[PDB]
Design a protein around this ligand. Structure first.
Ligand SMILES: *[C@@H]1O[C@@H](C)[C@@H](O)[C@@H](O)[C@@H]1O
Length: 46
């Protein structure tokens, strides 16, 4: 699977995705979580 696996915005919350070997990589901030930075670590009611 050597190619690009992030040509469809897999990560969110301003996640920095980068094309790497096999799969890709998303560099986010410590205040963000989720399988693809799609969740903000705000910790409110839920
Ligand atoms: C990509 O890296 C992450 C960690 C943030 O700094 C983004 O704003 C940047 O584009």
């Amino acid at each position: 699977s050597d190619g690009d696996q992030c040509a469809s915005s897999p990560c969110q919350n301003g996640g920095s995705c980068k094309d790497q070997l096999q799969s890709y990589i998303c560099f986010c901030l410590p205040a963000f979580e989720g399988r693809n930075c799609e969740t903000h670590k705000d910790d409110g009611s839920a």
